[PDB]
Structures are given as structure tokens and as C-alpha cells.
Design a protein around this ligand. Structure first.
Ligand code: NA
Ligand code: NA
Length: 250
């Protein structure tokens, strides 16, 4: 197992961009370690623009991968999963890491999922250890508990491609309306049909307000606290750990 293990982060559509950027800034400030930040933007023809960089001795760089076409809907998500694989392959051709962690915000969680089910096997020496998704709409904009969107049909159909040794955290709020931008709780909850019994551990966590596009301070602090505790596996103060533990729903 290599010394570098990057945390690769994939955001959602532009409505949820402010929250994403706020999360990264705050995650950098709250983590005692300096994590270097490299940003890739995949263009609509598949070429890549780069911003920032990885320090040569940083064991845990943050790599943001987003897309010029970051719009909603299955047609776009199917392309973003190909673009993610394009960027991922460019990264494994530059840097030697054989383990990584993934953060997917909003549609980013669906993009990551589809990539993991279908495309990660193309870099067979590189393994994912942990995935956290934040308010990812596994059943798109549906408020149904029984109807399956085309999006969810594709994620469920390929769920057996997921890596069996993966640990997955899915953060959801309790908001069950669509007014923009927000995803319904009933759609985020379809995550468990994809993950349970396909991966080593699946953990649902509630953060109130996490389903809304427009963030606020108190919700971002909780989210950064969880990313640190569960995605980064950082040792946390005892009362913080215990309180985050009580946010787990299963
Ligand atoms: Na830091
Ligand atoms: Na394409």
C-alpha cells in the first residue's frame, strides 16, 4: 500500500456549489494537518483544466474533480461518470497512489457511484477504502417510495460491480420537498438499496438541512465534523465523537 492516499471530491450542480466551496475551505481550516488542494475541471470534450497542486510530501492531498457540464439529470450524470474516469485515469498516470477516499456532494455521490460500479475495475491496482456521499439523489427528483427512476434503475442494475471491501457513509437531511434547490429525503434514501449487502459497511447519518441547495453555517460545521471523523478517520474530541455517533440512523 502506497504512502499517498488522496481524498477525491466531486461536487454536484451549480445550485449546490456555494455549500461545496464552503465545505472545502472549512475542512482545510479545521484539519490540523495542511492538505494540499489540486482542482481538475473536465471540459465537455474530455480535456482537463488544472488548478493548484499536490505537495511532493503530502500523504493525503485533496483533489477536487468537477465538470464544465455539471448539470442535473441522468443524461448528464452518465457523461460525468465517463469524465470522472477520464480524470481519474489521468491522475493515476501522474501520481502513484493505490488507495483513495471519495467524497461526493449532491449529484457527485451518484457520479462516484456509477464510476465505482462500472469504471474503477479499469484501474485494477487502485482501490477505494471509503466513500461518503452528501444528500445524493439516488432516485432523482421523485418523492416516491416505490417508483424507480431511470437513474436509480441504472445504479441498482450495476450495484454488484461495487467493491466488496468498501465502507460507505451516506448523509441525508429530513427535507421531503423538491423546491429548488432541494432533493427529497425519499430519493436520498434509495441509497440503501444500492449499498446494503454490496459493500462491507453502509452507514446512514442525518444532518438536518443537508438536502437543501442553500447551505448554512450550522449545517456545514456538522458536515465538516463528520467528514473528519468518518471519511478522514481523524481522532476527534470525546464529546464530538459521541455526538456525531448519535447522528448515525442505523
Ligand atoms: Na488543514
Ligand atoms: Na462523452
Amino acid at each position: 500500500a502506497t504512502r499517498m492516499a488522496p481524498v477525491i471530491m466531486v461536487p454536484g450542480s451549480s445550485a449546490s456549489q456555494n455549500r461545496f466551496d464552503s465545505l472545502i475551505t472549512e475542512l482545510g481550516k479545521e484539519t490540523p494537518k495542511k492538505h494540499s488542494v489540486l482542482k481538475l475541471t473536465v471540459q465537455t470534450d474530455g480535456t482537463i483544466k488544472y488548478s493548484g497542486s499536490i505537495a511532493a510530501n503530502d500523504n493525503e492531498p485533496f483533489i477536487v474533480i468537477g465538470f464544465a457540464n455539471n448539470r442535473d439529470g441522468k443524461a448528464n450524470i452518465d457523461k460525468q461518470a465517463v469524465w470522472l474516469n477520464t480524470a481519474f485515469k489521468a491522475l493515476v498516470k501522474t501520481y502513484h497512489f493505490n488507495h483513495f477516499y471519495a467524497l461526493g456532494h449532491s449529484n457527485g455521490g451518484l457520479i462516484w457511484t456509477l464510476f465505482l460500479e462500472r469504471y474503477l475495475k479499469e484501474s485494477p491496482k487502485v482501490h477505494i477504502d471509503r466513500l461518503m456521499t452528501i444528500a445524493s439523489p439516488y432516485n432523482m427528483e421523485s418523492t416516491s417510495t416505490t417508483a424507480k427512476t431511470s437513474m436509480f434503475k441504472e445504479l441498482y442494475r450495476y450495484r454488484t460491480g461495487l467493491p466488496e471491501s468498501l465502507t460507505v457513509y451516506s448523509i441525508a437531511g429530513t427535507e421531503n420537498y423538491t423546491s429548488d434547490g432541494t432533493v427529497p429525503y425519499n430519493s436520498v434514501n434509495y441509497g440503501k438499496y444500492i449499498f446494503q449487502d454490496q459493500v462491507k459497511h453502509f452507514t446512514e447519518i442525518t444532518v438536518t438541512g443537508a438536502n437543501t441547495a442553500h447551505s448554512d453555517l450550522p449545517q456545514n460545521k456538522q458536515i465538516v465534523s463528520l467528514i473528519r471523523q468518518y471519511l478522514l478517520a481523524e481522532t476527534m474530541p470525546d464529546k464530538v465523537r459521541q455526538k456525531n455517533a448519535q447522528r448515525v440512523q442505523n
